[PDB]
């Protein structure tokens, strides 16, 4: 397979390193932030459909599924939102893009708490509070399915995805750190959704393992 490797823009690499090295204890915020991103992407495709019905030809269901897998030590968050083209995937996760990253990095100096990370438009990276590696698989109506992945360290890879086709949307696979497996426990995931997410205008379904 063809794999491209990219460097994160410096400020994002710096942010990632701060997140990976922190003992910040309220790590459950990652779920609120990823669900929020899914909801924003769901809003995007749904808006586009008001004007163009064929936008949902790739899938009419608009929802978010949470899939813990204890055997694989992964928690997967899948949404059927607008997805990302390859260019937007690289831009949105590899650079400051539209975010307040610089202000956030100053806010951290000033000693603010990273729970404000989502208000600075960089909530995705909180995933690194709980994951050693994150894979993002995405399919936008205007492009092919791509898999982005990073274990931090300053780089990430993007490759065309040969996995199960998603009709449209984004799937985030969190390869959890050894000491963060509480997020694969059904009781914990339920408790967290309600505290940081029962505000979302889309169905959020937790798949219980058999
Ligand atoms: C990896 C982060 C993430 C992104 C998306 C997503 N899909 N499409 C888009 C889009 O704007 O086109 C996004 C998305 C959602 C929130 C964002 C974002 C992209 O960049 C900053 O904040 C998503 O649906 C879920 C996610 O967790």
């Amino acid at each position: 397979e063809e794999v491209e490797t990219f460097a994160f823009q410096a400020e994002i690499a710096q942010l990632m390193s701060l997140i990976i090295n922190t003992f910040y204890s309220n790590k459950e915020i990652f779920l609120r932030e990823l669900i929020s991103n899914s909801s924003d992407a769901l809003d995007k495709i749904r808006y586009e459909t008001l004007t163009d019905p064929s936008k949902l030809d790739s899938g009419k269901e608009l929802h978010i599924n949470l899939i813990p897998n204890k055997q694989d030590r992964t928690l997967t968050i899948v949404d059927t939102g607008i997805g990302m083209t390859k260019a937007d995937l690289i831009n949105n996760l590899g650079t400051i893009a539209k975010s307040g990253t610089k202000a956030f990095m100053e806010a951290l100096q000033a000693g603010a708490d990273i729970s404000m990370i989502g208000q600075f438009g960089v909530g995705f990276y909180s995933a690194y509070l709980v994951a050693e590696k994150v894979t993002v698989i995405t399919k936008h109506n205007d492009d092919e399915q791509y898999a982005w992945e990073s274990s931090a360290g300053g780089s990430f890879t993007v490759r065309t995805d040969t996995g199960e086709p998603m009709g449209r949307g984004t799937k985030v696979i969190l390869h959890l750190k050894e000491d963060q497996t509480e997020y694969l426990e059904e009781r914990r995931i339920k408790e967290i959704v309600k505290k940081h997410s029962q505000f979302i205008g889309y169905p959020i379904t937790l798949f219980v393992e058999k």
Side-chain angles (χ1 to χ4, degrees), residues 34 37-38 40-41 44 79 82-84 92-93 121 124 136 170 172:
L34 300 177
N37 282 7
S38 287
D40 292 350
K44 279 190 170 189
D79 65 67
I82 201 179
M84 295 176 271
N92 290 338
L93 303 186
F124 167 69
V136 177
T170 295
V172 177

Side-chain angles (χ1 to χ4, degrees), residues 52-125:
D52 185 339
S54 67
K55 289 293 197 165
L56 305 174
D57 279 2
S58 42
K60 293 174 236 171
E61 290 70 12
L62 294 176
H63 57 62
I64 304 172
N65 292 336
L66 305 179
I67 304 159
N69 183 147
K70 289 181 180 185
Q71 303 73 21
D72 294 350
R73 199 213 289 171
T74 58
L75 171 62
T76 296
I77 297 83
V78 177
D79 65 67
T80 52
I82 201 179
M84 295 176 271
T85 58
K86 190 194 179 181
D88 276 347
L89 173 64
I90 289 164
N91 197 55
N92 290 338
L93 303 186
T95 73
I96 285 176
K98 307 182 183 59
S99 75
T101 290
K102 296 198 181 176
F104 184 53
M105 296 304 281
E106 297 179 295
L108 292 182
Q109 300 302 53
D113 244 341
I114 74 167
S115 81
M116 278 195 101
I117 187 167
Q119 281 189 64
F120 288 83
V122 270
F124 167 69
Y125 303 91

Side-chain angles (χ1 to χ4, degrees), residues 58 78-79 137-139 145 161 164-171:
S58 42
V78 177
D79 65 67
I137 292 173
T138 189
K139 176 60 180 67
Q145 186 162 300
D161 186 36
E164 169 79 303
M166 298 163 65
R168 186 197 59 249
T170 295
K171 175 163 73 179

